[PDB]
Amino acid sequence: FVNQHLCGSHLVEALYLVCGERGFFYTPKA
Amino acid sequence: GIVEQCCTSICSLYQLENYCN
């Protein structure tokens, strides 16, 4: 589910699943 | 940034993990 174009909520969901208990940061404007 | 690497272009686990805490 990681190797594709991931945008918006779809990208946020991937980070959630991959990072797990570590958490993550989402910065659209970087 | 992440949108450029994962949204506009194809994402990868290597890049995604760069954003975990």
Short mmCIF file of N, CA, C and O in Angstrom, two decimals:
data_model
loop_
_atom_site.label_atom_id
_atom_site.label_comp_id
_atom_site.label_asym_id
_atom_site.label_seq_id
_atom_site.Cartn_x
_atom_site.Cartn_y
_atom_site.Cartn_z
N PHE A 1 0.84 -1.23 0.00
CA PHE A 1 0.00 0.00 0.00
C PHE A 1 0.87 1.26 0.00
O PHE A 1 0.36 2.37 -0.12
N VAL A 2 2.18 1.07 0.14
CA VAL A 2 3.14 2.17 0.18
C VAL A 2 3.68 2.65 -1.17
O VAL A 2 3.92 3.84 -1.37
N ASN A 3 3.85 1.73 -2.11
CA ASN A 3 4.42 2.07 -3.40
C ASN A 3 3.44 2.52 -4.48
O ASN A 3 3.20 1.83 -5.47
N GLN A 4 2.93 3.73 -4.28
CA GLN A 4 1.97 4.34 -5.20
C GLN A 4 1.87 5.83 -4.87
O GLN A 4 2.55 6.32 -3.97
N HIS A 5 1.04 6.55 -5.62
CA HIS A 5 0.82 7.97 -5.38
C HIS A 5 -0.13 8.04 -4.20
O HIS A 5 -1.23 7.49 -4.24
N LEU A 6 0.34 8.66 -3.12
CA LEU A 6 -0.45 8.81 -1.90
C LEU A 6 -0.64 10.30 -1.61
O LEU A 6 0.32 11.02 -1.34
N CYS A 7 -1.88 10.76 -1.67
CA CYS A 7 -2.18 12.17 -1.44
C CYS A 7 -3.27 12.35 -0.40
O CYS A 7 -4.15 11.49 -0.25
N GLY A 8 -3.22 13.48 0.29
CA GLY A 8 -4.23 13.80 1.29
C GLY A 8 -4.42 12.78 2.39
O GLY A 8 -3.44 12.32 2.99
N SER A 9 -5.68 12.43 2.65
CA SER A 9 -5.99 11.46 3.70
C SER A 9 -5.34 10.11 3.42
O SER A 9 -5.02 9.37 4.34
N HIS A 10 -5.11 9.81 2.14
CA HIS A 10 -4.49 8.55 1.74
C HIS A 10 -3.03 8.48 2.21
O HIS A 10 -2.54 7.43 2.62
N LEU A 11 -2.35 9.62 2.16
CA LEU A 11 -0.95 9.72 2.59
C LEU A 11 -0.88 9.68 4.12
O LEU A 11 -0.02 9.01 4.70
N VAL A 12 -1.80 10.39 4.76
CA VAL A 12 -1.89 10.46 6.21
C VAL A 12 -2.14 9.06 6.80
O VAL A 12 -1.53 8.67 7.81
N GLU A 13 -2.98 8.27 6.13
CA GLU A 13 -3.28 6.91 6.56
C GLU A 13 -2.04 6.01 6.48
O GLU A 13 -1.80 5.19 7.37
N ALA A 14 -1.27 6.16 5.41
CA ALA A 14 -0.04 5.38 5.21
C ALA A 14 0.97 5.66 6.31
O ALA A 14 1.56 4.73 6.86
N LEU A 15 1.15 6.94 6.65
CA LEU A 15 2.08 7.34 7.70
C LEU A 15 1.64 6.76 9.04
O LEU A 15 2.46 6.28 9.81
N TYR A 16 0.33 6.79 9.28
CA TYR A 16 -0.25 6.24 10.51
C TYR A 16 0.07 4.75 10.67
O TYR A 16 0.47 4.31 11.74
N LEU A 17 -0.12 3.99 9.60
CA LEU A 17 0.13 2.55 9.61
C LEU A 17 1.61 2.18 9.69
O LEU A 17 1.99 1.26 10.41
N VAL A 18 2.44 2.91 8.95
CA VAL A 18 3.88 2.64 8.93
C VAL A 18 4.60 3.06 10.21
O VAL A 18 5.36 2.28 10.78
N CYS A 19 4.33 4.27 10.68
CA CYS A 19 4.99 4.78 11.88
C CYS A 19 4.53 4.18 13.21
O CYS A 19 5.30 4.16 14.18
N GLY A 20 3.29 3.70 13.26
CA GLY A 20 2.77 3.10 14.47
C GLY A 20 2.85 3.97 15.72
O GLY A 20 2.51 5.15 15.67
N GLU A 21 3.32 3.38 16.82
CA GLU A 21 3.44 4.07 18.10
C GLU A 21 4.49 5.19 18.14
O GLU A 21 4.57 5.93 19.12
N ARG A 22 5.30 5.28 17.09
CA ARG A 22 6.32 6.33 17.01
C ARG A 22 5.65 7.66 16.68
O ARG A 22 6.11 8.72 17.10
N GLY A 23 4.56 7.60 15.92
CA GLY A 23 3.89 8.82 15.51
C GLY A 23 4.62 9.36 14.29
O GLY A 23 5.59 8.77 13.81
N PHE A 24 4.17 10.51 13.80
CA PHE A 24 4.77 11.11 12.62
C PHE A 24 4.40 12.57 12.53
O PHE A 24 3.63 13.08 13.35
N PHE A 25 4.95 13.23 11.53
CA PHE A 25 4.64 14.63 11.28
C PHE A 25 4.28 14.77 9.80
O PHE A 25 4.89 14.13 8.93
N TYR A 26 3.21 15.51 9.55
CA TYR A 26 2.72 15.74 8.20
C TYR A 26 2.83 17.23 7.90
O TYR A 26 2.15 18.05 8.51
N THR A 27 3.71 17.57 6.97
CA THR A 27 3.93 18.96 6.59
C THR A 27 3.78 19.13 5.08
O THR A 27 4.74 18.93 4.33
N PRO A 28 2.57 19.48 4.62
CA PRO A 28 2.26 19.68 3.20
C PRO A 28 3.12 20.76 2.56
O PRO A 28 3.56 20.61 1.42
N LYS A 29 3.34 21.85 3.29
CA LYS A 29 4.14 22.97 2.82
C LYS A 29 5.57 22.92 3.35
O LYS A 29 5.88 23.51 4.39
N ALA A 30 6.44 22.21 2.64
CA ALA A 30 7.84 22.08 3.04
C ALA A 30 8.79 22.12 1.83
O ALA A 30 8.79 21.16 1.03
N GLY B 1 9.30 18.32 -0.51
CA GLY B 1 8.72 17.72 0.73
C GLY B 1 8.03 16.39 0.48
O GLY B 1 8.16 15.81 -0.60
N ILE B 2 7.26 15.94 1.47
CA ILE B 2 6.55 14.67 1.39
C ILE B 2 5.53 14.56 0.25
O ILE B 2 5.36 13.49 -0.33
N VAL B 3 4.86 15.67 -0.07
CA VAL B 3 3.87 15.67 -1.14
C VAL B 3 4.55 15.46 -2.49
O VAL B 3 4.06 14.72 -3.34
N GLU B 4 5.71 16.09 -2.65
CA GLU B 4 6.50 15.97 -3.87
C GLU B 4 7.02 14.55 -4.06
O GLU B 4 6.98 14.02 -5.17
N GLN B 5 7.47 13.93 -2.98
CA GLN B 5 8.02 12.57 -3.03
C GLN B 5 7.01 11.43 -3.01
O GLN B 5 7.26 10.36 -3.58
N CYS B 6 5.86 11.66 -2.38
CA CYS B 6 4.84 10.62 -2.24
C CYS B 6 3.51 10.83 -2.94
O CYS B 6 2.81 9.86 -3.24
N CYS B 7 3.15 12.09 -3.19
CA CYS B 7 1.89 12.39 -3.86
C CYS B 7 2.09 12.66 -5.35
O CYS B 7 1.49 11.98 -6.19
N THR B 8 2.94 13.63 -5.69
CA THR B 8 3.19 13.95 -7.09
C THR B 8 4.00 12.84 -7.78
O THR B 8 3.85 12.60 -8.97
N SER B 9 4.86 12.17 -7.02
CA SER B 9 5.63 11.05 -7.55
C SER B 9 5.32 9.83 -6.68
O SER B 9 4.67 9.95 -5.64
N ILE B 10 5.75 8.65 -7.11
CA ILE B 10 5.48 7.44 -6.35
C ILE B 10 6.25 7.40 -5.03
O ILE B 10 7.44 7.71 -4.97
N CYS B 11 5.53 7.06 -3.97
CA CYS B 11 6.08 6.97 -2.63
C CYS B 11 6.89 5.68 -2.43
O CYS B 11 6.94 4.81 -3.30
N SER B 12 7.54 5.56 -1.27
CA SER B 12 8.33 4.38 -0.93
C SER B 12 8.41 4.31 0.59
O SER B 12 8.26 5.32 1.28
N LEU B 13 8.63 3.11 1.13
CA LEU B 13 8.74 2.92 2.58
C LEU B 13 9.94 3.71 3.13
O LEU B 13 9.86 4.31 4.21
N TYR B 14 11.02 3.75 2.36
CA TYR B 14 12.23 4.46 2.74
C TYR B 14 11.91 5.93 3.04
O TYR B 14 12.33 6.46 4.07
N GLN B 15 11.16 6.56 2.14
CA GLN B 15 10.79 7.96 2.31
C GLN B 15 9.75 8.19 3.41
O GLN B 15 9.84 9.16 4.15
N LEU B 16 8.77 7.30 3.50
CA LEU B 16 7.73 7.42 4.51
C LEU B 16 8.31 7.42 5.92
O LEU B 16 7.92 8.24 6.76
N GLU B 17 9.27 6.52 6.18
CA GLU B 17 9.89 6.43 7.49
C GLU B 17 10.69 7.66 7.87
O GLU B 17 10.99 7.86 9.05
N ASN B 18 11.03 8.48 6.89
CA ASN B 18 11.77 9.71 7.15
C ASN B 18 10.89 10.67 7.94
O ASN B 18 11.39 11.60 8.57
N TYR B 19 9.58 10.44 7.90
CA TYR B 19 8.63 11.30 8.59
C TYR B 19 8.07 10.76 9.90
O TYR B 19 7.23 11.41 10.52
N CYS B 20 8.53 9.59 10.32
CA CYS B 20 8.08 9.04 11.60
C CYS B 20 8.87 9.77 12.67
O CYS B 20 9.94 10.32 12.39
N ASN B 21 8.34 9.80 13.89
CA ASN B 21 9.04 10.46 14.99
C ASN B 21 10.17 9.60 15.55
O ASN B 21 10.22 8.38 15.24
#
